[PDB]
Design an enzyme around this catalytic site. Structure first.
Site, PDB file in Angstrom:
ATOM      1  N   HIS A 284      -7.816  -4.998  -0.190  1.00  0.00           N
ATOM      2  CA  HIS A 284      -6.553  -4.299   0.001  1.00  0.00           C
ATOM      3  C   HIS A 284      -5.946  -4.703   1.340  1.00  0.00           C
ATOM      4  CE1 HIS A 284      -3.717  -1.038  -0.745  1.00  0.00           C
ATOM      5  NE2 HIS A 284      -3.959  -0.523   0.447  1.00  0.00           N
TER       6      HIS A 284
ATOM      7  N   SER B 147       0.821  -1.211   0.000  1.00  0.00           N
ATOM      8  CA  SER B 147       0.000   0.000   0.000  1.00  0.00           C
ATOM      9  C   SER B 147       0.865   1.277   0.000  1.00  0.00           C
ATOM     10  CB  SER B 147      -0.947  -0.022   1.207  1.00  0.00           C
ATOM     11  OG  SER B 147      -1.966   0.947   1.058  1.00  0.00           O
TER      12      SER B 147
ATOM     13  N   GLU C 140      -8.899  -3.980  -4.671  1.00  0.00           N
ATOM     14  CA  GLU C 140      -8.196  -2.996  -3.837  1.00  0.00           C
ATOM     15  C   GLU C 140      -9.088  -1.908  -3.250  1.00  0.00           C
ATOM     16  OE1 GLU C 140      -5.349  -3.666  -3.058  1.00  0.00           O
ATOM     17  OE2 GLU C 140      -3.926  -4.058  -4.685  1.00  0.00           O
TER      18      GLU C 140
END
Ligand SMILES: *[C@@H]1O[C@H](CO)[C@@H](O[C@@H]2O[C@H](CO)[C@@H](O)[C@H](O)[C@H]2NC(C)=O)[C@H](O)[C@H]1NC(C)=O
Length: 534
Positions: A449, A209, A341
């Site tokens: 995610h 991330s 995501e």
């Protein structure tokens, strides 16, 4: 007790953690307190000889995400998100937080020359710490497969502490303080890892991330010149969800806006020198003032209050233009995404239920997009619920008529399709890409995610063969296929190349696919990337 020597020969003592040896809480910089707030870190010069490093130091000041997962997610989905620890403030925290930790196999001697996996934690550039997302599982697995690696993690400043922007910060040249922190830690590794048994010429930087975007930033840092003391700071990079940051420069509109809010809330609006006033604030006041800007899980969502921005010197320009113009280091890379995501982030706008509200939301999120560009965008991402994320779930997971649409859009711009743009222009080295669908069927979020964190650091799952096995092989031999997986990982050249170019993951094992999905969305978003910057 395990011991190691530093650059100057000083000897430090670590911790025998039974399954591995750890050297925790090593200071790599002077506390970025008071006068040093917002400024790049200053290397630590005090001698550490004879000291012990058997416990983590505190994390950098954390910004409350202002989110609410246990209010919108069903048990199984919620349990996984919690297990991943993503977007959770790490305590204890303090401004004196610039420490680094080293995890190595037991019995590792200074002469081991092991490859080094330098981890950059992700927390939306507003929270997070090196103490979470443990590297133990990675190290244990490297030992098991006979290709031992040393795991290194560092804290870096987040929120206002690490990414305050605006005209004053820019004029002083203090943009992206948190990235500087990471950069100094990388230099620290170049100078000190040998004494722990690592090989400084075999550093693979990786992150997830915000940490993945940071990893990408390190590729374009100083226009791709990653040499320090005459040697490359790293030989490869792994990006788990994210690369280019879609952001305007430090003194841009939203960076200046967030800065003015912090200044006003801190009681510095009448100061003749705003920066100096902020630097003279108690730790609590600066924290409170920061808490008065939106967090990552609040409504603005990926329109982050704090994130890396072009500063003109270290990140010299629009990051999308940086990759197009070849201003990057030449190293092979792995970059992949989780199928969905954007689901976690779409949970921040569940009060947006109509096409009109969606449009208004996109317009406020992307201040540079014309009505025409928004039209095209809303035509690429329709309200047809079967076309949104969780992808390929038909009529399911539509908690609102717009959730799957907004999730798909945010996930693609910030992660998945941005990756395709990077892969299409990046010619620095051999490229390998992956798309996980390990959690297909998971209600509401899907293969969300950060779920990779679970299979990389906490549990063994089908995806673990990639996040662990393949990544270790890459750090060792610069080729994930040396992992000996029963499914060959093809090299990636372009989104239109012939055959399957993505290593993919399902609930049971591996398979390959094509990075050719949602093409009109790719064109709608990137015919002019700047039109969708924050
Ligand atoms: C969805 O909820 C958010 C959160 O309350 C709304 O955003 C706030 O809107 C108020 C009034 O318009 C503003 O004063 C606040 O500054 C906003 N807060 C944030 C987080 O930015 C948003 O307007 C709502 N959206 C819809 C479609 O109703």
């Amino acid at each position: 007790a395990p011991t190691a020597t530093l650059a100057n020969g000083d000897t430090i003592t670590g911790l025998n953690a039974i399954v591995n040896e750890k050297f925790l809480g090593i200071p790599f910089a002077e506390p970025p307190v008071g006068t040093l707030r917002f400024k790049p870190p200053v290397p630590y010069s005090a001698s550490l000889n004879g000291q012990q490093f058997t416990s983590y130091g505190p994390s950098c000041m954390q910004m409350n995400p202002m989110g609410s997962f246990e209010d919108t997610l069903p048990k199984n989905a919620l349990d996984l998100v919690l297990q991943s620890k993503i977007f959770q403030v790490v305590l204890p925290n303090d401004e004196d937080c610039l420490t680094i930790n080293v995890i190595r196999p037991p019995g590792t001697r200074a002469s081991a020359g092991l490859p080094v996996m330098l981890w950059i934690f992700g927390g939306g550039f507003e929270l997070g710490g090196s103490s979470l997302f443990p590297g133990d599982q990675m190290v244990a697995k490297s030992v098991l497969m006979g290709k031992p690696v040393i795991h290194v993690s560092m804290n870096y400043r987040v929120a206002s502490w690490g990414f305050l922007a605006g005209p004053d910060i820019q004029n002083e040249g203090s943009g992206n303080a948190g990235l500087h922190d990471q950069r100094l830690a990388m230099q620290w590794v170049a100078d000190n890892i040998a004494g722990f048994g690592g090989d400084p010429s075999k550093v693979t930087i990786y992150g997830e991330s915000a940490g993945s975007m940071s990893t990408f930033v390190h590729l374009v840092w100083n226009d791709g010149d990653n040499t320090y003391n005459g040697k490359p700071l790293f030989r490869a990079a792994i990006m788990q969800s994210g690369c280019m940051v879609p952001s305007d420069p430090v003194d841009g509109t939203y960076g200046t806006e967030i800065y003015n809010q912090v200044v006003a809330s801190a009681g510095c609006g009448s100061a003749s020198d705003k920066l100096a006033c902020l630097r003279g604030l108690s730790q609590d006041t600066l924290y409170q003032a920061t808490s008065d800007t939106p967090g990552v899980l609040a409504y603005p969502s990926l329109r982050l209050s704090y994130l890396p921005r072009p500063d003109g010197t270290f990140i010299t320009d629009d990051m999308y233009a940086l990759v197009r113009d070849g201003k990057y280091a030449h190293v092979p890379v792995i970059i992949g995404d989780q199928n969905d995501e954007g689901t976690l982030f779409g949970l921040s706008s569940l009060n947006v239920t109509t096409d009109a509200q969606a449009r208004a939301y996109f317009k406020q999120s992307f201040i540079h997009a014309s009505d025409a560009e928004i039209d095209t965008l809303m035509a690429a991402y329709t309200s047809d619920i079967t076309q949104g994320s969780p992808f390929d779930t038909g009529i399911f997971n539509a908690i609102t008529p717009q959730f799957k649409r907004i999730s798909a859009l945010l996930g693609d711009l910030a992660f998945t399709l941005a990756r395709r743009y990077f892969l299409n222009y990046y010619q620095g080295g051999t490229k390998y890409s992956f798309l996980s669908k390990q959690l297909s069927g998971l209600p509401v979020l899907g293969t969300f995610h950060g779920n990779d964190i679970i299979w990389q650091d906490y549990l063994v799952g089908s995806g673990s063969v990639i996040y662990n096995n393949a990544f270790i092989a890459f750090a060792n031999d610069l080729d994930p296929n040396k992992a000996g997986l029963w499914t060959n990982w093809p090299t990636y050249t372009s989104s239109s190349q012939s055959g399957n170019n993505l290593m993919q993951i399902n609930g049971l094992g591996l398979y390959t696919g094509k990075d050719n999905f949602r093409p009109d969305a790719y064109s709608a978003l990137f015919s002019n990337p700047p039109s969708f910057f924050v």
